[PDB]
Amino acid sequence: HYVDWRMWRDVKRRKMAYEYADERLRINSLRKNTILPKILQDVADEEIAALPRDSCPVRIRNRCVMTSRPRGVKRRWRLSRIVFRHLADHGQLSGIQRATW
Amino acid sequence: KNRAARVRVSKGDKPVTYEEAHAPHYIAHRKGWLSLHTGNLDGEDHAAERTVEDVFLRKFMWGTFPGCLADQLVLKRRGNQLEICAVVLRQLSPHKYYFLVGYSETLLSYFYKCPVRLHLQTVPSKVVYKYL
Amino acid sequence: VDVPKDLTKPVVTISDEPDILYKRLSVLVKGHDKAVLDSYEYFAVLAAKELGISIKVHEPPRKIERFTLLQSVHIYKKHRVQYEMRTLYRCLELEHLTGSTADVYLEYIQRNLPEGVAMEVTKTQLEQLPEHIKEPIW
Amino acid sequence: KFEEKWSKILELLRHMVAQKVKPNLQTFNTILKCLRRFHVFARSPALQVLREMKAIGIEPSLATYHHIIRLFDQPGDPLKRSSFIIYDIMNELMGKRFSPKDPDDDKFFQSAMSICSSLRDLELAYQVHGLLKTGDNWKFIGPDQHRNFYYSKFFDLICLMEQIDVTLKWYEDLIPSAYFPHSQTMIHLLQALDVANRLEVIPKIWKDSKEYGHTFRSDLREEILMLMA
Amino acid sequence: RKNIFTGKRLNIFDMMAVTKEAPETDTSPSLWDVEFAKQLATVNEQPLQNGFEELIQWTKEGKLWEFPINNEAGFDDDGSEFHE
Ligand SMILES: [Mg+2]
Ligand SMILES: [Mg+2]
């Protein structure tokens, strides 16, 4: 019942990224330093590279939560410019108004 | 030409309410906001969550009181209280209004985990501000 | 004629523990509507005078956040719509009040906080030196 | 017969003392609630149960006096006994805040006000309503059916025994804030205006009658027209 | 001219030396005791009379926030100390 299949794929990416966040964090700490031996860091590189692709947080996309628009989104409200304006122009967004100066 | 939230001129037979008769550039000048909360103030959080809740409450009430709403809802938040002020018509019997009030307040309280109240003001007919 | 004869008053117990001393309470309210802050100021100030609290008021400079959005759903880049959010402030500064007086006043004005108005209350408490610091060990 | 039942009960109570079992409030409330059948035969025995509570240390609740009120409130002439029983019960309960102890505590005020109307004693009705207004005692008035019965008897007694200037103050304080009146209460109010020679208020009582759902009451419209004409 | 509280008594029972000096704190809540406690909550059951009583009721039930506002209300991180 999500807007489209692309939103459903991002929902699953956010879920899998949340489940592997602690593991990826711990493995990454082994790689992000010059203290541990290279032999141990090379093994950590292979370990984090073997985790599922959809656990990587860079693949998450901030889509409009009502229309799934992938661009033109305002992060504070998580709405696309078109949907945001529709609500703002009907006076349904508390404290938001047209700007003239 | 601009279109957003503008009821366009007609033959003089279209009744419009005060809210519908004002374009977006009159917000904060001649008309207030339909929802009041602290989410959009500087340094405040959770504006996104308050927005989704408002959009749902407006659709819920529209379909829960079908053909009864005579104007847009006014949503107010104080602390963790949620007040819903609606202007309805005088066509449904009072018994059905009391049923729907008790039903909607209870259902929304369990859905959003907060005390919800619904205040109804009845009017004999849709208040007309002008005929466009 | 139909008036209550005797009223049960809420029980206020005097404890044996000493009370907190607040040097200052800085109540900063934020809102979108200046008139609402004016009414709230009048209410909060009148409430403080009746309870015997010394209070001052001033208005920090407002903040206006503006941003721009495209006007058309498609192309027409050189045509935008600009929006803003206005945050107006009012600062109530209360001085020399105990912890019990601060709990009553804050509860009274926080419950009556109008919709669309947030509050940030900064409390400056007075404390004595810890006993370990009053002298060096050696 | 009563003597046979009263002999068995006194045997259980003596058994309860042989087994080292202490009676509670419900032990004496059940006795008083079960003696309601015998009425006159159980009037003096019932008062022995009350004095038995006070001595032992059990404090009578609102239900204890409700059962004594209903026991003495038998159809007949209440002036012989029911007079001094309610007068002594109110001197004991005067200025007391009550707590819920027995399931039948929410039936006293309905019973106490029912006798005040039978005795036609307005000073006693003010003491009953005064006790209902001290502290949180107003929550013992009972469900809606009991609340309407309490105010119907209370206001109908005001219209009868109270001055019309004070009657119209209670009329504004109680209706509709406290309860909605029965069509017979509007007729008792008109009969009070007639006795007071204040008929300029009749048009107001008709306006209020319609606002209380008595627009199509035959007995009411005939009463109003007869007084005016 | 005789008060009702003066006269004969049953004399079957005896004055409690003192009320139960030590209670049964760990008494089990049998179905008979849990149901009799609900019959005592019904004798004081009345509809809310004004807006203050609705706020008082919601506060006792836990629906309404307690004032003055404490942003940490209901959240103690397992009673941990700062040195942990
Ligand atoms: Mg990206
Ligand atoms: Mg243009």
Q: Looking at the complex, does the CB of residue B41 fall below 8 Å from at least one CB of chain A?
A: yes
Asked if residues A78 and A63 have their Cβ atoms less than 8 Å apart, the reply is no
State the resolution, in angstroms: 2.4
State the DSSP H helix or E strand holding residue E53, giving kind and residue range, or none if neither.
Answer: helix E51-61
Count of residues making up chain A: 101
Secondary structure (DSSP) of B61-79 = HHHHSTTTB-S--EEEEET
Whether the CA torsion D27, D32, D37, D38 is positive or negative: it is positive
Burial of B94 (0-12, 13-18, 19+ CB in 10 A): exposed
Neighbouring CB atoms inside 10 A of D178's CB total 17
CA distance D68 to D92: 14
Tell the burial category of E2 from Cβ atoms under 10 Å away from its Cβ (0-12, 13-18, 19+).
Answer: exposed
Compute φ and ψ for B88, nearest 5 degrees: -120, 170
Q: Give dist(CA A56, CA A17) in Å, integer.
A: 6
Q: How far is the C-alpha of A57 from the C-alpha of A62, rounded, in Å?
A: 11
- Among A85, A87, A89, A93, the strongest candidate for a mutation testing the C interface, having the largest count of C CBs within 10 A, is A85
In chain E, which residues have their Cβ closer than 8 Å to the Cβ of B79? 64-65, 69
- Tokens 């760990």 -> residue: E26
State the maximum Cα–Cα separation within chain E, in Å, rounded to a whole number: 78
Backbone phi, psi, residue D175, to 5°:
-110, 125
Phi, psi of B116 (to 5 degrees): -110, 140
Please provide the DSSP assignment of E12-35 as one string: SS---SSS-SS--TT----HHHHH
Tokens 């008594």 correspond to E9
Q: Which ligand is nearest to the CA of B2?
A: 2
Instruction: Report the C-alpha dihedral over residues D115, D118, D124, D129, rounded to 10 degrees.
Output: 60
Q: Which residue has the tokens 């103050």?
A: D169
B36–A contact, CB cutoff 8 A: yes
Whether the CB of E16 is below 8 Å from some CB of chain D: the reply is: yes
CB-based contacts of E60, cutoff 8 Å, min separation 6: none
Instruction: For B79, name the nearest residue in chain C, comparing CA atoms only.
Output: C111
Contact between B89 and B125 (Cβ < 8 Å): yes
- Chain B residue closest to A74 (CA)? B48
Q: What are phi and psi of B38, to 5 degrees?
A: -95, 5
Nearest CA in chain E to D23: E13
CA of B83 to the centre of ligand 1 (A): 39
Q: How many CA atoms lie within 13 A of D190 on its CB side?
A: 23
Report the alpha-carbon distance of residue C54 to residue C98 in Å, rounded. Answer: 12
DSSP bridge partners of C68: C82
The amino acid at residue D219 is D
Preceding omega of D176 cis (within 30 degrees of 0): yes
Distance A57 CA to ligand 1 centre (A): 9
C65: nearest CB among B38, B42, B78: B42
Which backbone phi and psi does C85 adopt, to 5 degrees?
-125, 120
Cβ burial of E50 (10 Å; 0-12, 13-18, 19+) is: exposed
The reply to whether residue C70 touches residue A81, judged by beta carbons under 8 angstroms, is yes
Chain C CB within 8 Å of residue B126 CB: no
Place of tokens 């005797």: C6
Residue D96 structure tokens: 């007391």
E4 contacts chain D (CB < 8 A)? yes
| DSSP 8-state symbol, A68 | -
Residues ≥6 apart with Cβ < 8 Å to A85: B4, C69, C81
- Taking an 8 Å cut-off on Cβ atoms, the answer to whether C30 and B36 are in contact is no
Paired strand residues for C125:
C22
Residue numbers of C between 111 and 130 with CB closer than 8 Å to E = 111
Q: Measured between CB atoms, does B9 come within 8 Å of chain A?
A: no
Other CB atoms within 10 Å distance of the CB of residue C67: 14
DSSP string, A1-65: --SSHHHHHHHHHHHHHHHSHHHHHHHHHHHS-SSS-HHHHHHHHHHHHTS-GGG-GGG-----T
Rounded CA gap, E67 and C12, in Å? Answer: 16
First to last CA, chain A: 43
Between chain A and chain C, are at least 3 CB pairs below 8 A?
yes
Spatial separation of the C-alpha atoms in residues B104 and B73, rounded to whole Å: 14
CB contact under 8 A, C70 and A95: no
Minimum distance, in Å, between the CA of residue C69 and any CA atom of chain A: 6
In 3D space, the residue among B72, B57, B66, B58 whose CA is nearest the CA of residue B16 turns out to be B72
Cβ distance A16 to A52 under 8 Å? yes
C-alpha–C-alpha distance, residues D216 and D209, integer Å: 10
Query: Which two three-digit tokens encode residue B37?
Result: 């909360």
Angle at B102 between CA B100 and CA B106, to 5 degrees: 115
Cα–ligand 1 centroid distance for A11 (angstroms)? 15
- For residue B65, how far is its CA from the centre of ligand 1 (angstroms)? 42
Instruction: Provide the 10 A C-beta neighbour count for residue D217.
Output: 17
Could you tell me if residue A91 is left (phi over 0), alpha (psi between -120 and 50 degrees) or otherwise beta? Answer: left
CA A98 / ligand 2 centre spacing (Å): 14
- Say how many Å lie between the CA of residue A28 and the centre of ligand 1: 20
Measured between alpha carbons, how far is E1 from E3 in angstroms, rounded to an integer? 7
Distance separating alpha carbons of residues B51 and C72, to the nearest angstrom:
23
Task: Report CA(A25)–ligand 1 centroid distance (Å).
Answer: 19
Cα of A70 vs centre of ligand 1, distance in Å, is 10
- The approach used to solve this structure was cryo-EM
Chains near C with 3+ CB pairs less than 8 A apart are A, B, D, E
- What does the alpha-carbon distance between residue E26 and residue C132 come to, in Å, rounded to a whole number? 44
Q: Name the one residue in this structure whose structure tokens are 């700062």.
A: E82
Helices D164-174 and D144-161 sit at what angle, rounded to 10 degrees?
A: 160
Do D170 and C1 make contact, defined as CB atoms within 8 angstroms?
yes
Secondary structure of residue D156 in the 3-state scheme = helix
Closest-CA distance of chain A to residue B130, Å: 18
* Ligand number nearest to the C-alpha of A61: 1
In terms of CA atoms, which chain D residue is nearest residue E45? D139
CB B80 within 8 A of CB B38: no
Beta carbons of C53 and A70 less than 8 angstroms apart: no
Find, among A85, A40, B12, the residue nearest to C70 by Cα: A85
Which of these, B90, B85, B73, lies nearest to B19 by C-alpha position? B73
Chain A interface, mutation test: which of B44, B51, B59, B77, most A Cβ atoms within 10 Å?
Answer: B51
Ligand number with the minimum distance to the CA of A60 = 1
| Chain E residues inside the 8 Å CB shell of B80 | 63-65
* D80/A52 Cα distance (integer angstroms): 95
Cα–Cα distance measured from residue C55 to residue C60, given in angstroms and rounded to the nearest whole number = 16
Restricting to E residues 44-73, those with a Cβ less than 8 Å away from any Cβ of C are 67-69
State the CB neighbour count (10 A cutoff) for residue E12.
17
What value does the CA radius of gyration of chain A take, rounded to a whole number of Å?
Answer: 20
- Does B touch D (3+ CB pairs < 8 Å)? no
